[PDB]
Amino acid sequence: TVARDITLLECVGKGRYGEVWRGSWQGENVAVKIFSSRDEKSWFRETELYNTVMLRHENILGFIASDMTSRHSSTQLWLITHYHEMGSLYDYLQLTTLDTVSCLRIVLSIASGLAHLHIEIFGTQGKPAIAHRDLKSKNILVKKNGQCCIADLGLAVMHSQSTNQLDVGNNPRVGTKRYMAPEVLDETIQVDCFDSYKRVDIWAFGLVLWEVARRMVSNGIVEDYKPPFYDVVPNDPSFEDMRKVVCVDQQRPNIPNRWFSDPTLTSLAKLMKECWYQNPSARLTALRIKKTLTKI
Numbered sequence: 001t002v003a004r005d006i007t008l009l010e011c012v013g014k015g016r017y018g019e020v021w022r023g024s025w026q027g028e029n030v031a032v033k034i035f036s037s038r039d040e041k042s043w044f045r046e047t048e049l050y051n052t053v054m055l056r057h058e059n060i061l062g063f064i065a066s067d068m069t070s071r072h073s074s075t076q077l078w079l080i081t082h083y084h085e086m087g088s089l090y091d092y093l094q095l096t097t098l099d100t101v102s103c104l105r106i107v108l109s110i111a112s113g114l115a116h117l118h119i120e121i122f123g124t125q126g127k128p129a130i131a132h133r134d135l136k137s138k139n140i141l142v143k144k145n146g147q148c149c150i151a152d153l154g155l156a157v158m159h160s161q162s163t164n165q166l167d168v169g170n171n172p173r174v175g176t177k178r179y180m181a182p183e184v185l186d187e188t189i190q191v192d193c194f195d196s197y198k199r200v201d202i203w204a205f206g207l208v209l210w211e212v213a214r215r216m217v218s219n220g221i222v223e224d225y226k227p228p229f230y231d232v233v234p235n236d237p238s239f240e241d242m243r244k245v246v247c248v249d250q251q252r253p254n255i256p257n258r259w260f261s262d263p264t265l266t267s268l269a270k271l272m273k274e275c276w277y278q279n280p281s282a283r284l285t286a287l288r289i290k291k292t293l294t295k296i
């Protein structure tokens with residue numbers, strides 16, 4: 001097994017979810033995610049997407065292996081992937097500023113990964129449509145070629161159109177609250193429409209776009225890194241804090257005045273806005289976002 005042969009070198013993240021480690025396998029770095037015994041359903045879900053759907057793309061974090069052992073005494077659950085030494089988009093944006101080329105390359109690579117997840121491809125290379133449900137800057141990793149890939153499919157839901165089957169799962173985990181869409185916060189989300197879940201991803205994508213664009217330099221000016229809604233909610237905000245801001249007050253992240261002196265940041269401001277409509281059916285699709293980014 002890949003797991004018995006791996007040496008854990010350093011913990012690069014710990015949380016409610018479990019732990020992610022840098023490890024060594026056959027002389028190469030790998031990333032190991034060790035799940036809490038209480039998050040067992042996430043491990044299975046992510047595993048079965050990778051091992052049964054054969055989900056593979058430049059902009060989706062690359063699967064190597066998955067291992068589990070269980071006795072009455074204890075259960076260990078490991079997901080092993082490629083290691084990206086630059087870390088998350090969240091870590092990266094704190095240390096670094098961007099130019100037009102490197103900003104476009106980041107947001108274009110996210111949109112490609114998301115569109116690949118959302119689109120149903122039939123038959124031989126087959127794949128159902130997949131919604132992520134926890135998109136955020138921490139779940140995006142930065143590669144050395146300046147592109148990004150999307151990680152963490154523990155909450156993903158699938159839909160096949162050859163069948164009429166929606167696979168939600170029975171997972172007690174739910175999204176990161178800061179990135180939750182209006183319809184999730186006010187509970188008007190159409191829980192039996194698969195498209196509802198894609199539109200929730202598009203909302204979160206818009207917030208990530210905002211995060212990245214802030215760090216693009218324009219006419220000698222740049223903002224510091226902030227997470228969405230930094231000015232109106234505390235760290236680790238509650239469901240209710242987010243509901244007041246997003247539903248009741250209808251707030252969206254502020255667009256700095258300086259962006260409208262730059263053609264690219266101007267084009268990105270318009271996309272962001274079309275991800276954030278209160279009405280989910282009015283939001284753009286992942287494919288359209290990709291096409292619009294391609295046009296610049």
Ligand SMILES: COc1cc(-c2cncc(-c3ccc(N4CCNCC4)cc3)c2)cc(OC)c1OC
Nearest residue numbers: 012031032033081083084087088091138139151152
């Ligand atoms: C976002 O979730 C994941 C991320 C990674 C992952 C893969 N490759 C590199 C990193 C990574 C490396 C360094 C950092 N740093 C941030 C803090 N200080 C510097 C190091 C962060 C993330 C993380 C692997 C995962 O499943 C295996 C995983 O869950 C599916």
